[PDB]
Ligand binder design. Structure first.
Ligand SMILES: [Mg+2]
Ligand SMILES: [Zn+2]
Ligand SMILES: [Zn+2]
Length: 1259
DNA sequence: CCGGAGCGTTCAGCGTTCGTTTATCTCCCCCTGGCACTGTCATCTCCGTCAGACCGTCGCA
DNA sequence: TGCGACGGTCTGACGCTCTACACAGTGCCAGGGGGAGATAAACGAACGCTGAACGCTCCGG
């Protein structure tokens, strides 16, 4: 598996694959139910349907396998041969391929200079095509044919003159005889009128035949190859008049004959000549066509695959006709399509056997062509073939395309064995590495292991007896099951699996019931509530799989979230409330025994059990030797005339008993914490523990925190009664005053002194004031003791706006189609809404539900696009030799006389490395190539630095992939990233995970459309897809004088740069709201109008670093407006994948086409190649493209095919005959090999393991 | 004190019975061919995606 | 040729199981060729009958 090739398949290859001809449309016999001979499903062509048997019934045994039966020809072998053995159909008339005709010009190619409508007219038998003309023979005898035509014209004119003379004589004769007879008074006038009517009719006939001769003559005089004529009567006239001069044809045979005489190299030369001298859209034409001609010139694939003579067939087991219970049959649609193809081909053969008219033959040929096209693509042209009358008939290309195709439903995602699924329940008795599997589910997963152990422990005689015991379910089987599942990890997995931690390895443990017991401490890593949530369990099977489960996937090793490096395995519902209650202050709770000395924590616990001491009471408590004092305890000390060190020995501290118990949970080496914990302080404590302590200690400490959090949340006394939710007493008088002034405004409006829009605006303004003020009143009324505030102020669960709309009034609520009702909801959920208030609240609720459904769908789509563009980005080197980096701001927004560090330094500068040392006073502050943390950044900002040159992934120049040092330390593990970690996939998952968490939509348009830019997740998609924004703000090209032009039809802006530069003019709509002065000084940096800048021009006029900063900052301010934090390197990986290409111009010396996508590495290699030859290099402008366009424009066609476009990329690969190296992860998942990342690298699989000499000597 | 008779086992004459084929005689399946007043253009699709892009196409300028 | 715009074309439109189903209006027979099954015979084989015949222990007058 060095690589995988693809190309056009000629008739020879199709015949070589085939084991025979499918000469009959019959599939199976209706009585014997055996496949027919020499047709579809035939055993002679496709192999035996039985095992080692054959059609005629002879040769039943297995011994004489691999022989050809003389009676029927069926080779005796296995039935699975029918999954690999194919045949072919020979066509009576050649037909074209529907992928290449009727497609994109990158796919059709315009190989022959014909329009797509012209190709349609020629191949579907509506117009003849002149494939060959003897041009030199036609031009050599021009005087002879001209003389013949002149002779024909002369004799025609002589006949016309003789006829005119005879007609005149007849007219004179009849006039004379009817004027001599005198039958009527004016019969001579009537006969003269009839005669002249005859004269004009014959003159019309003469002029129409003269025009016919003239038009056929000028049709022959302008006759070239690839010239069509719609009128078959006209072509018949040319054939009957002119012979052996021009060769004509009709249908796909005309294209085949044209491709027989096609001379592609001279056409390529002519297109290159037009490239040298050409303008306009034809230029682009002269570009695109040339590319496809090059695709037929450089590679070895002949264009004989353009039109096909033989049709391959699927092996019959991949288009099965299976028996169904009740005597029915289930048949694939490809059997119907193939049957139609053979039917039409056989009918065409029968028509060609005997004498048939050309119209019937051409009609049957067109039917055969349409049958082949519907076989390859049903529904590409016209109405799709339906069948029973309900749904379109599935074709060959419809299972290589879309969600139902082979690439996405059967290769990337597959069903698995040794897997199960059950609902989850919380088990607090479990450790962090444990999960509770039911008896039946674990017995079914570990069935062969249980059978082997039963055989080994001689409880069963053999495998069959062990299987019978397992199926019966005896108690010794369950004892064996308990013995087996130990030390054998299983992978728990929740279905949405947005990010990396959706699959985690746990040690299984037998539990009762039928539900999986999961640890609470890990649930939010899975985003798993216990409303109802089925989790799947997969079984790592070999030593490698369960080794990776134990080492890489263990749930106790995944404390930190890979998105931003913050801890994720500290859920907050009940444990944080308990720890907060334990560690909170004595505010609002009656402290008994406050301010009394205690000898030890045990005595304080005894006093608490006695009841004369409460948990929250400032007491003077002594601590034994080995207890580390708080970090703030060091500057104070005990007063003594002798030297003392309270860092290692006993000390007294003024604290509550709850803090003493909480620090009993924490390790003895950890410094004492003397503050209210809650949630955020718990986050910094857990982050410090994960940073400074080993994994097992961290797992034990989170287990202790979990256990004591549950324990003290039980005794915290939190509950909900109707007296626990309190409406403010001020709310009644405040809403009374606001209704009084609202009644005053309304009775003022009834006189018409104010418009309704102004009244609505002031009403929503004053009611927003009222709801903010009553929120303030509620936030003043609450005590620190009631459970609802105790669980919203502790970060446990809840938000302040939920308490605002539970205790105080709901506030302004959006109406349908996104405006606000002027009348608010004055009732709290405790008081109960009225009927109409409930209705207008349902207006917003249903919108929210629909919005979050579509938002999570779009987030999944964005995640898929990001993963497919960001793959094949793997740390492949330990370090670069580089010292180039990114200049990031470290301290900003400084006041007078002080310096403040950056607000978002955690996701911008942290977890990176310095490209070079930093010195301010001649001494180094921080070394080079070290991770940045709190203390180092604090030292930098204290010593007085304003910017830091840090080593980023955008500036990485490595020969393969990116290095570990330029990427920086990994955020999932907190250490330096290993060589082989897929950083692109981690980056894509981290970007796409909070897409459903954003929950953003424009509140109100304000009555104007287009004034507001896209916000939320669609803004992120627009940013990553390189699309021009909805509100575009043009950027000035150069510094100069800017002025406005207020033309009535459309506004206009004109800026003239100084230093003789050319003036640039931008058109602006009348609804502009710009911010630049009229006739003022402007430069490149600022924007002329207000809106969202287009990143393409930002790349164009400012540079690649400026547009990198722009994109990173834009996506980070979209994400930061909600509150989600994502590190900058995750964005920068995709941004580097975004700027990887270049658009080339004046490429007359680099010997390739101009104005197309070129990779940076290939362009640079071509630049060295052309400067080593001495020629001047071509020009190249960096091109910023979407993630979809960067995904499709990839070297490997397997990854391109498995992505969105599935038919066009395969045609393009077939024309280009491109073979893909099997590097990358999608085309290694597809083929089944190891991915080239992580444990699948070559540098990890080449180690050899043997024991040491002393270990052998010991035993 | 061998001699004969009865008994055990083992083979050559012709005498019948099997093991496996063969052509002829009913019953059925399956494919090609005949019908002679005249009778010479069907068929319903497809709408309250959807969101914007990519692209060629095309008449106006 | 540049212009918008007109239009067709094309693509996907988070994830799983618990659940999970099936699918409907217009002819008819005669003459002839093959192979499935029943028939009665046939050339060759071996299958039995004929006890005879060789040789042994044998009780023996
Ligand atoms: Mg749930
Ligand atoms: Zn056979
Ligand atoms: Zn590097």
């Amino acid at each position: 598996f060095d690589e995988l090739r693809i190309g056009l398949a000629t008739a020879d290859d199709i015949r070589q694959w085939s084991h025979g001809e499918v000469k009959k449309p019959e599939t199976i016999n209706y009585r014997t139910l055996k496949p027919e001979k020499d047709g579809l499903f035939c055993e002679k062509i496709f192999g035996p349907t039985r095992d080692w048997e054959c059609y005629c019934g002879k040769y039943k045994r297995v011994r004489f396998k691999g022989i050809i039966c003389e009676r029927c020809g069926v080779e005796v072998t296995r039935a699975k041969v029918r999954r690999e053995r194919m045949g072919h159909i020979e066509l009576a008339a050649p037909v074209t391929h529907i992928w290449y005709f009727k497609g994109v010009p990158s796919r059709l190619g315009y190989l022959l200079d014909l329009a797509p409508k012209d190709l349609e007219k020629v191949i579907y038998f509506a117009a003849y095509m002149i494939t060959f003309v003897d041009e030199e023979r036609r031009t050599r005898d021009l005087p002879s044919l001209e003389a013949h035509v002149s002779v024909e014209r002369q004799q025609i004119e002589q006949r016309r003159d003789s006829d005119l003379e005879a007609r005149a004589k007849k007219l004179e004769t009849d006039l004379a005889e009817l004027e001599a007879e005198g039958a009527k008074a004016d019969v001579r006038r009537k006969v003269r009128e009839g005669a002249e009517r005859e004269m004009k009719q014959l003159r019309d006939r003469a002029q129409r035949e003269i025009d016919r001769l003239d038009e056929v003559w000028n049709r022959f005089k302008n006759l070239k190859v690839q010239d069509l004529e719609g009128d078959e009567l006209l072509y018949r006239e040319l054939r009957d008049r002119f012979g052996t001069y021009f060769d004509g044809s009709m249908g796909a045979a005309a294209l085949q004959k044209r491709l027989e005489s096609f001379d592609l190299d001279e056409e390529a030369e002519r297109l290159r000549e037009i490239i040298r001298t050409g303008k306009g859209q034809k230029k682009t034409r002269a570009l695109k066509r040339l590319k496809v001609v090059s695709a037929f010139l450089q590679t070895s694939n002949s264009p004989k695959g353009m039109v096909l003579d033989c049709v391959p067939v699927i092996p019959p087991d991949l288009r099965p006709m299976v028996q169904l219970d009740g005597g029915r049959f289930a048949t694939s649609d490809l059997n119907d399509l193939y049957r139609r193809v053979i039917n039409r081909n056989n009918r065409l053969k029968r028509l060609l056997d005997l004498g048939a008219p050309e119209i019937i033959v051409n009609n049957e040929k067109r039917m055969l062509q349409e049958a082949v096209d519907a076989l390859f693509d049903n529904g590409r042209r016209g109405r799709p073939v339906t069948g029973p009358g309900n749904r379109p008939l599935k074709s060959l290309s419809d299972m290589l395309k879309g969600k139902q195709g082979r690439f996405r439903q059967n290769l990337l995602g597959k069903r698995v064995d040794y897997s199960a699924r059950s609902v989850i329940v919380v088990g607090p008795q479990l450790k962090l590495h444990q999960c509770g599997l039911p008896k039946a589910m674990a017995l079914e997963l570990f069935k062969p292991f249980v059978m082997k152990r039963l055989v080994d422990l001689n409880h069963a005689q053999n495998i069959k007896s062990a299987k019978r015991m397992v199926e019966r379910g005896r108690t010794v089987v369950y004892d064996v099951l308990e013995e087996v599942i130990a030390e054998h990890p299983v992978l728990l997995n929740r279905a949405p699996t947005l990010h990396r931690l959706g699959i985690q390895a746990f040690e299984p443990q037998l539990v009762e019931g039928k539900a999986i017991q999961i640890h609470p401490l890990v649930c939010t890593a899975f985003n798993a509530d216990f409303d109802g949530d089925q989790m799947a369990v997969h079984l790592p099977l070999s030593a490698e799989a369960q080794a990776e489960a134990r080492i890489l996937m263990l749930s106790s090793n995944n404390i930190l979230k890979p998105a931003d490096g913050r801890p994720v395995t500290m859920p907050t519902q009940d444990m944080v409330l308990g720890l907060f209650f334990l560690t909170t202050d004595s505010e609002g709770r009656s402290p008994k025994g406050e301010g009394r000395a205690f000898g030890s924590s045990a005595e304080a616990i005894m006093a608490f059990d006695a009841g004369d001491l409460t948990l929250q009471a400032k007491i003077d408590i002594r601590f034994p030797v080995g207890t580390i004092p708080p970090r703030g305890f060091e500057p104070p000390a005990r007063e003594e005339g002798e030297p003392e060190w309270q860092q290692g020995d006993t000390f007294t501290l003024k604290t509550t008993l709850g803090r003493a118990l909480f620090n009993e949970l924490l390790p003895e080496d950890y410094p004492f914490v003397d503050y209210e914990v809650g949630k955020k302080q718990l986050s910094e404590i857990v982050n410090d523990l994960a940073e400074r302590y080993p994994k097992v200690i961290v797992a034990a400490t989170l287990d202790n925190l979990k256990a004591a959090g549950f324990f003290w949340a039980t005794r915290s006394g939190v509950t909900v009664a109707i007296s626990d939710i309190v409406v403010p007493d001020a709310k009644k008088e405040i809403v009374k005053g606001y209704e009084g002034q609202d009644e005053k405004v309304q009775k003022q409006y009834e006189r018409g002194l104010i418009t309704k829009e102004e009244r609505t605006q002031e009403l929503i303004a004053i009611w927003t004031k009222a709801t903010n003020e009553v929120a303030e009143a509620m936030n003043d009324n609450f005590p620190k003791t009631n459970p609802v505030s105790m669980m919203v102020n502790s970060g446990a669960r809840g938000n302040m706006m939920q308490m605002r709309q539970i205790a105080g009034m709901r506030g302004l609520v959006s109406n349908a189609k996104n405006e606000t009702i002027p009348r608010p909801i004055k009732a709290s959920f405790r008081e109960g809404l009225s009927v109409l208030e409930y209705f207008i609240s349902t207006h917003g609720a249903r919108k929210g539900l629909a919005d979050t459904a579509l938002r999570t769908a779009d987030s999944g789509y964005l995640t898929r696009r990001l993963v497919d563009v960001s793959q094949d980005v793997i740390i492949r080197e330990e370090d670069c030799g580089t010292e180039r980096g990114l200049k990031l701001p470290i301290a900003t927004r400084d006041a007078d006389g002080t310096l403040r560090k950056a607000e978002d330094v955690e996701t911008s500068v942290y977890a990176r490395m310095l490209a070079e040392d930093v010195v301010i006073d001649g001494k180094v502050i921080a070394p080079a190539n070290v991770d940045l943390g709190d203390v180092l950044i604090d030292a930098l900002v204290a010593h007085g630095v304003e910017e830091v040159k840090t080593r980023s992934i955008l500036t990485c120049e490595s020969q393969v992939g990116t290095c570990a040092m330029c990427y920086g330390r990994s955020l999932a593990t907190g250490k330096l990233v290993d060589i082989g970690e897929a950083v692109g996939i981690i980056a894509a998952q981290s970007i796409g995970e909070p897409g459903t968490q954003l929950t953003m939509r424009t509140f109100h348009t304000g009555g104007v459309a287009g004034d507001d830019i896209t916000q939320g997740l669609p803004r992120v998609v627009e940013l990553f897809e390189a699309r021009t924004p909805k509100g575009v703000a043009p950027i000035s090209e150069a510094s100069g004088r800017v002025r406005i032009e207020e033309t009535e039809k459309t506004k206009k802006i004109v800026v003239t740069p100084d230093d003789g530069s050319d003036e640039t003019a931008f058109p602006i709509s009348k609804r502009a709201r710009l911010l630049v002065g009229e006739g003022d000084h402007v430069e490149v940096g600022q924007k002329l109008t207000v809106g969202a800048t287009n990143p393409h021009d930002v790349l164009r006029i400012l540079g690649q670093r400026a547009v990198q900063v722009h994109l990173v900052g834009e996506v980070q301010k979209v994400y930061n407006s909600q509150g989600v934090s994502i590190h900058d390197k995750h964005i920068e990986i995709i941004i580097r994948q975004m700027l990887r290409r270049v658009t080339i111009i004046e490429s007359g010396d680099a010997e390739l086409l101009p104005g197309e996508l070129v990779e940076r590495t290939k362009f640079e290699t071509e630049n060295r190649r052309v400067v080593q030859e001495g020629g001047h290099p071509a020009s190249g402008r960096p091109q910023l493209m979407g993630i979809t366009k960067a995904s499709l424009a990839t070297e490997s066609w397997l990854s391109a095919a498995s992505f969105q476009e599935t038919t066009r990329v395969l045609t393009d690969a077939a024309i280009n005959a491109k073979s893909d190296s099997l590097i990358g992860l999608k085309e290694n998942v597809i083929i089944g090999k190891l991915i080239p990342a992580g444990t699948g690298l070559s540098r990890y699989r080449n180690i050899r393991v043997e024991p040491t000499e002393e270990a052998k000597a010991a035993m």
